[PDB]
Swiss-Prot record:
Protein name: Insulin-like growth factor 2
Chain positions covered by the region annotation B: 1-28
Chain segments carrying region D: 64-69
Source organism of this protein record: Homo sapiens (Human)
Gene: IGF2
Region (C) residue spans: 29-42
Lineage: Eukaryota, Metazoa, Chordata, Craniata, Vertebrata
Sites annotated Important for interaction with integrin: R24, R34, R37, R38
Region listing for A, in residue ranges: 43-63
Portion of the full-length sequence here: 25 to 91 of 180
S-S bonds: C9-C49, C21-C62, C48-C53
Length: 69
């Protein structure tokens, strides 16, 4: 269903990632590299700020596996 806050950006997006994943860790742009920050690879921002997303879509960026069992 529609949410008035179906988009997030900046710290809002980080806070929601901290909520679904815990402070245990999450990816933002899944870079898996540390060579520089001259490479703005696409990620969660494009799905949640430049587009709308749900907590469930957002949870796919967690740096830990699902443990609902």
């Amino acid at each position: 269903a529609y949410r008035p806050s179906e988009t997030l950006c900046g710290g809002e997006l980080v806070d929601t990632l901290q909520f679904v994943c815990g402070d245990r860790g999450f990816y933002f742009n899944r870079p898996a590299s540390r060579v520089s920050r001259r490479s703005p690879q696409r990620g969660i921002v494009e799905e949640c700020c430049f587009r709308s997303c749900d907590l469930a879509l957002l949870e796919t960026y967690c740096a830990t596996p699902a443990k609902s069992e």
